[PDB]
């Protein structure tokens, strides 16, 4: 796999901004947002895989990412 951070294209980012309520967007915003999102997700994958590898499992379960987000003080609902 290569360069998939650009696969989440600028139009999708615009869709987020419209969902975020934004009228004008600087051209440099998109890559900076990919960076912030990148580090953010790296934090998610890091502790998530730590939970997966700890349990000697090869598959990442939903409950693990719930625990990870909960550790970061951003509780996510939606799983019974």
């Amino acid at each position: 796999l290569r360069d998939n951070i650009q696969g989440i294209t600028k139009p999708a980012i615009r869709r987020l901004a419209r969902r975020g309520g934004v009228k004008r967007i600087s051209g440099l915003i998109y890559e900076e947002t990919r960076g912030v999102l990148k580090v953010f997700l790296e934090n998610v994958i890091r502790d998530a895989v730590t939970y997966t590898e700890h349990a000697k499992r090869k598959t990442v379960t939903a409950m693990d990412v719930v625990y990870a987000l909960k550790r970061q003080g951003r509780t996510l609902y939606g799983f019974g």
Partner: protein, 95 residues
């Protein structure tokens, strides 16, 4: 006419803020997740619902960032976001 600047923007904001379906392309997102995930273990096994939950948390986090960023801009007598403004917001957020 040529659909004046701001009308299409405001109506689009109303429509997508009025709806709730997922907005990020699934295969680029999933492959991006696996690609970044390679830096600990290559070829992860993923639940689809996990990928969806990451899309949920991710887009809520980003939209919320647009909310705080936009409020900082409007407060700063601006309506145009800048990367330095986002960096200021995250600094205020503690990042």
């Amino acid at each position: 006419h040529r659909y004046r600047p701001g009308t299409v923007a405001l109506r689009e904001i109303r429509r997508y803020q009025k709806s709730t379906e997922l907005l990020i392309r699934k295969l680029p997102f999933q492959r991006l997740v696996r690609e970044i995930a390679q830096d600990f273990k290559t070829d992860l096994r993923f639940q689809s619902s996990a990928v969806m939950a990451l899309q949920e948390a991710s887009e809520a986090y980003l939209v919320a960032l647009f909310e705080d960023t936009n409020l900082c801009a409007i407060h700063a007598k601006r309506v145009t976001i800048m990367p330095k403004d986002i960096q200021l917001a995250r600094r205020i957020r503690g990042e």
